[model samples]
Target chain A: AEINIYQNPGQSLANIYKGFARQCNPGFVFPEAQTIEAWDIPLRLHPEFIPGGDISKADQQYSTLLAQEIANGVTIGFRMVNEKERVCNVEILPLLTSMAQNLDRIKARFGSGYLDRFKGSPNVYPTDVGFSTDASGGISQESGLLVSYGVNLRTLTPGTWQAMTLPEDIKALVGPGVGLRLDAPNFSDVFNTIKSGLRYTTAVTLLLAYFAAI
Target chain B: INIYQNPGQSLANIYKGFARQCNPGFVFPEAQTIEAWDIPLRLHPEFIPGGDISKADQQYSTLLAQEIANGVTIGFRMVNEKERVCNVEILPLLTSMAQNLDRIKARFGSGYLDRFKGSPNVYPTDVGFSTDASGGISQESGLLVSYGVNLRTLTPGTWQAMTLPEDIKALVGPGVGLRLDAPNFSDVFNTIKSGLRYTTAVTLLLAYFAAIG
Candidate 1:
């Protein structure tokens, strides 16, 4: 059952992603035995499992593995949900929203084109994995079920087709397919500059001290 | 009695006056007033009844005032093993030195001891000294001598008044003639002051950067 969103959207999001990942990977022990504490692992490692929680290599890797698992799970969810009454709402929508937010934040701060540079959308679904960029959780890019790709996944069937003009193909996805050249700034060069400054300062101080001593 | 005798006086009034002030309510004990610099001066210097007060709860003070070549001065801090009176005895700051020294001469040419005719028992807190000027040579005594041997002295400035060092400035005190020393407040005191300055600027410098951030 969908936990009422207002009660604690965090728990709702956690439960959804938990369901998605478990469905994707029957391998991971989601709820430890003895206690059906399904949300226990995610609740404990919420920052890692939560969207945009790339606080460390561990978190990013955890999320990376998670994306792979979700790809597998969503493939299953697509088949199951299409057949309906099989599984209620997977709550994965909120999970994807969180990841999208994380992507935007990491992009702004670390300044590469965010998750798009990661070869595929981290939240929207892994590239080369999902069916279409369409939102209505469908197979075809038909006009009636155009998806509004925002924080929440929604179908604009009652309205017109897509509005915003997205690029030809996700840059990271088509790199191997095309002779694409990247234009992002080498932000890590800032650290190199800091190291250079420290070296110059140390060298100058040493030279002056050596001369004075002689 | 101070050795600097005035030209016409028969009685060493300066000396007598100093002697009277030394042991306020007690009998005058020592005859050899030469060792005037012996801190907590003993009534009897030669046969000092008590042992050397080298450590027995004693305080040492140094001062040099003007009387002649090096205004032979004296020091203080004493205890009477006999009377058991461990009193931090008071010293006489020159009333002449005290009154902003306005009323007295900077160098009184051999005269009887003078007293402050001013209204307050003490002067301004910043005025160098209470009863007298601030630094060195209490009207009573001045010197940093061990026995009558190494009699080191500091010259009293123009007013025959000893001065304090540049850093150890005097702090404001309770009474007109009283004040203390401290670094804060700029040692900036009202009266009987030391190390003071007033300005329209706050010369304190602090650097902080808000570059692009």
Candidate 2:
């Protein structure tokens, strides 16, 4: 499951990061005048966004460090249609190889057009929407789990179309709380419709949570 | 130039020699009749020296022999010419053949031509009549031949100008006893013929065969 929070104009990456941190870790009460460190969270930067004369050299250094962190375990929480979405720390190193291969296969079959329109620009993945959190225990006691949840950026865009009508397989994966509709005039209204349904379902779940607790 | 060499004599001798060598006891009734009629007709069809029996029988026998011998001789000549023409065209044809084959293979991928197997053999297949057939031939076979040729020959760029269905009738032209029984037969035939002719002519013009010779 994935959710994309719309970014207001002039919003900074740090602001989005803080919003996610506050939402995911609501109980992390900080002092009024002291430095608060909930977890030693590091921001992973995509190579294309980084400026340097030797980008490949920088990428190698960055990827090595990132790969090590991923192998250990990290987690990030996003709002789900529940009281709170839990982020578990686990290794995602095994998944990286498969994800890269899948991306390559897609590029080969449909040409770079599919990737350009859908996947983040070359050599970038949506690691920003989710962050890696370390388990409470030390490195040895941590469960080798790396959790991530991110919206597909292409699907987030308005009026971006797919050649094939959304296939049944994809529709099935989208399951409940997702509805598809096509209307004229504002063709992009379909995406907004789905978004509304998602919000409605999340509101209902929150109401159920309140009742269950009572 | 009477050059009236016993044309049938060589054929007879070969037949007799084969009979003796392979099947000595084989009595060919046709050979016996040919032998009986050969000498007398070579002498005089009228001077058999009997009544109407001799004259009528002699004249009938001579005419049959002459017709059969002419047919056999013409057939042999046609076959020899066919082979000679094919041999002459081989090197020139090869240059274009290689080019055309490679082009098609590249475009459609290798082994695509194998689909047309068992289809009608048009130009470069039917040798003597090839030029005639391209110009025009019998309606059904000609159209079939043309269709096969055009489908194989024409490229994508020239497809529209060729106006395949419309231009097919003009390929063989007027009074050639050719008509497009099927749609675009003429266009198809002409397309193939034109391709072959173009390639063959270029090959010949460049004196490609000089290297082989």
Candidate 3:
């Protein structure tokens, strides 16, 4: 059964990928029995039932293959959910709306122009404060608002959450083959940069206060 | 009758005052006055009957001053102990530092220069040892010492008219003094954000290349 999209989409994505791998390699047994139902799959390769003397060598080869499979599955999942008119109604749009609202809240608390710090120009208001959609394969011919490719802060879709649905055709199909190349200034990097800068400033201020006092 | 002429007599008065505060109806075995010093002054430094008052006064001043100095000595020693706590626990910030490296990696990726750019190297190498003289380290007691040592010498009129310094008064009563204000954290964050604009160009370029590459 398709797990409810709301419960744990990341786990659902992993399950789908693992299911495909199991189908492809019936002779192999996954390394972790418990992770079959888990949100995150362990990186260990599924070992073959019949090891042809060099079981270690076979396992090592399988490791790279399994990693590729996992990466591909995750990439496809991200792309399907985030790309224009993909799975935004259920997952991506809701998150973006919430994030946009949160950005507004942050601005309200600090100032109307607080997020101007992240913008390219002081005059330019940031509409896409998140990852870009079309650059699902990581490579892009032209740059988006924040970056060239990888993750940009642009909204995934214009529709409201739960207002859109997946087309009947692509529902059961394997993911698109293209992969996203996550680049710098992705949501995580931006947050981390801001936090690190804050910490540095705080530490520097405390030290200066003490030094000046002395 | 003059408690300021004798240190032991004034200490007894302070003791009695404290005891009365703790238990309002409490009574000492002997009176707190100098006349009853022979009986009630068991714990304090002894002043011999018919001994030199000046000699006894000196003894009380030296001992009281030493007691205050030891407090400062213990505070200094604790600072060293505090360093151990900071070093073993708070200083490394391993997780945040690792996250910082991850951000740097995601930004520069394979194009990262080994020598030019590095993760935040905030580990303090040379913290020059500062020797600050805690004022009360020596036996030279200020005006407060006179209050504790030669309190008996002050007349009732002088004692009533005088007020202790704000710091000394706080020790005895409520700590009501002017507060030292610090820079607000919001202002500090704003200051940091101001500096970030200078490096915005490089940040934009590196972020672009890293994402696209």
Candidate 4:
């Protein structure tokens, strides 16, 4: 059976594109990064296991894999939360909001043309899948869920998105990827690829979700 | 009793007067007169004794005699003996020399005859008195001789004079007498007296005499 990775509604796919675009070309590459090797993306990769070998793992794994594929052509930010009963309430929600806001500010400060060149958009959405609830008394009796979303550059035009600027030093280090390159024009391909990696992102998202709930 | 020759002036009347007032009729006329001389006449014998000097000087040789002796010879002897006793037993080396002399006089007789007559010395002179006579030993010579002989005896004999201890106590006495009189002898005498006093209660008691004497 073929697995269909569901991307969340509206500008979610476009938002994922923006997140990737922000990573590809940060503005004002820092001198330190010139001397030292620069990471083109500000993304972290982590893998985690849910206690039960349940169907939720299968679903979240599929989403995470999709997210990874989407992230192949762009930087995909990542983090982990390993506790039980984590929720999407405080942990993931606030991060998603901050990432969105950061992209908006980057587009505004560096000008829409610069943002477009970097394919920046601020409407990205995190996805979760393959996450399930556990009911065993000994095992973690919590259901885990995954969701994904992103922005379309067409929605976050000069008048639509607020620009967020990065520090000069950080810009110098990462070039156009510094603050809000996520909503730049032509960010769709990277965003869709990251959407495909939602399987891995979902698994992590579920783990983090459990931690946030706890 | 020949009344016509003014025989009331006879030797018998004078003898009666001498017997009544002076010598109680001593048989010797010179003796009676000698007994009647004043204290000053005895002490300073240069003053002549009263008599017909020209007739007596030609007939019988005139004699100059010390009429009333000052008794210091006997005084100093007795003082010396007492001081000897004190030094031998009490060991008061700082006692006063004057006190030592007085002590000697008090212990022995106070008579000049008793002190000067029988012994080798003829008389006792004041401590500071001296003579200019050439041949015979002067007063200072006599004092030196007596002190030397006694000092030698004191060194060897058990009868040590209390010179050191007495002198020490004298110097240590109240007032400035020590500094004026025995300045040179002060330290040695004071040390001996103090050491003896510390060692024994008898010596301590004698130290009182060393100061007081």
The 0-to-1 C-alpha lDDT of every candidate, in the order given, reads: 0.24, 0.29, 0.28, 0.27
Can you give the lDDT of residue A191 in candidate 1? 22
Order of candidates by TM-score, top first? 2, 3, 4, 1
B1-213: candidate 2 lDDT, tens digit per residue: 111223234434433443343335433323322322243233333433443433444433444455456545534554456443223332223322223222232223334434334434422222122223355443334323311333222233333222111222243232133334656655555564553322222222112111111
- Candidate 3 structure quality by residue, lDDT tens digits, B111-164: 333322222211111001111146322222111111011111223443322222
Q: Show the lowest summed lDDT stretch of 10 residues, model 4 chain A.
A: A34-43
Q: Which 10-residue window in model 3 chain B sums to the lowest lDDT?
A: B122-131
What tens digits encode model 4's per-residue C-alpha lDDT throughout A53-154? 333563454355445646642333442223211222233333333333444444456553422322221212233212222233221212211122222211
Candidate 1 local lDDT, B1-213, one digit each (tens): 222121112112333444454555432312212212221223123222254433222111111122221211222222223122122211222211112111111122112122212212121111222222453445422211111110112211221222112112122112212223333322333332222211000000000000000
i-RMS, each model, one decimal: 45.3, 20.5, 25.6, 66.0
DockQ of each: 0.00, 0.01, 0.01, 0.00
Q: What is the lDDT of residue A18 in candidate 3?
A: 48
By TM-score, the better pick of 1 and 2 is 2
TM-score of chain B of each: 0.17, 0.24, 0.20, 0.21
lDDT of 3 by residue, A1-214 (tens): 7442123223444456445335434443432222222221111111141154343444443344334445655664667634534443333333223323433344455564432333332111111122333434443422222321111312221111112222222111101101111331233444344222221112212211112222
Greater-TM-score candidate between 2 and 3: 2
TM-score of each: 0.14, 0.19, 0.16, 0.14
Runs of candidate 3 exceeding 4 Å displacement: A1-15, A23-28, A31-37, A40-214, B1-213
Q: Chain B in candidate 3 has what TM-score?
A: 0.20
Stretch of 10 with least lDDT, candidate 1 chain B: B199-208
- The digit string of per-residue lDDT tens for model 1 on A117-156 reads 3332223311112112334454442111111111111121
